Amino acid sequence: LPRCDSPFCSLFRIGLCGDKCTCVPLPIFGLCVPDV
């Protein structure tokens, strides 16, 4: 599959990275993981 929706996101700002992948808990703007 193609790259995730967004490059990074915040622990609270999960909605941002919820189009193709899931937001990470890492408050350091971790890298979203591709949910297959």
Side-chain angles (χ1 to χ4, degrees):
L1 34 55
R3 274 285 90 182
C4 292
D5 167 276
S6 104
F8 63 83
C9 56
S10 252
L11 165 52
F12 218 58
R13 306 285 186 189
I14 181 146
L16 275 170
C17 203
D19 255 277
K20 305 296 286 161
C21 306
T22 299
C23 196
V24 291
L26 313 186
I28 196 118
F29 314 90
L31 190 67
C32 297
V33 181
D35 58 276
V36 293

